[PDB]
Amino acid sequence: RFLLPPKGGTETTRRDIYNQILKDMAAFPENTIVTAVLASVDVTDNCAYVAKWDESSDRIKKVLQRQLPLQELDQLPDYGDIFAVLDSINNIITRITINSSSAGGGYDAYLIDFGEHIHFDGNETIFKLPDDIKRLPAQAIRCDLINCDIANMHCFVNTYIKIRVHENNNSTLVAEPVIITEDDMAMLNEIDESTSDPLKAVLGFRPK
């Protein structure tokens, strides 16, 4: 059975949903070199995403590695509201928001911690986050990477990199890449299997 459609909220574009979610811009100070995970490289939209994945994000990490039980949901939350979705094949649970209704069926959704826009069929297994996790800042910060080969940068997704922050306007970054607990690396391997899944682009996240 499909999830019930959202009862409320304002539908938004991919650019707008990124603007509406909470983001910790203080983690990327200008004129400094910082260590961050290359969350995603969108070679169709040019821009990349960086995530601090700092000790303050520990609750999100616990949900992602299925270390915390969550209440399964049958009613999609409102557009712009934050919840969790299960990638059943790769066994990880990630934070998500529905930004709009799709004309052909389903919805447009944003993976706030990965910086990825995906189609949401409405058959996906979804959960309610506890309020503290729900209120945590989105890990993925939009970043214009300069002086580098973006295509080559795509292979370094889900790895720690060092970036020189040229500009931090408070919604996006202009950064140049420069050429960490054991649990953090283990989590990145778990994320990479979901990200590298051969059918993720075609089917999105699979149910059950």
Numbering used by the authors: 287 to 465, 483 to 511
Per the authors:
In the 2.1 Å eTud1 apo structure, crystals belong to the P212121 space group with two monomers in the asymmetric unit. The overall structure is similar to eTud2 apart from the C-terminal region (484-511aa) that forms a long α-helical fold that inserts into the narrow interface between the Tudor and SN-like subdomains. We named this novel C-terminal helical topology the “latch helix”. The latch helix is stabilized through formation of extensive hydrogen bondings and salt bridge interactions with its amphipathic concave binding site within eTud1. Furthermore, eTud1 possesses a ‘latch helix’ that must move out of the cleft to allow Ago3 binding providing a potential regulatory mechanism. First, the N-terminus of eTud1 contains a long-loop (spanning amino acids 272-300) connecting and interacting with both the Tudor and the SN-like subdomains. Pro292 within this N-terminal loop forms a CH-π interaction with Tyr365, Glu297 in the loop region forms a hydrogen bonding with the backbone of Ser387, Arg300 in the loop forms a hydrogen bond and salt bridge interactions with Asp394, while Tyr304 in the loop forms cation-π interaction with Arg428 in the SN-like domain. All these intramolecular interactions help to stabilize the overall structure of eTud1. Although the overall topology of eTud1 is similar to other extended Tudor domains, eTud1 has its own unique folding and recognition characteristics. The unusual binding preference of eTud1 is reflected in its non-canonical binding pocket, which lacks three of the four conserved aromatic residues.
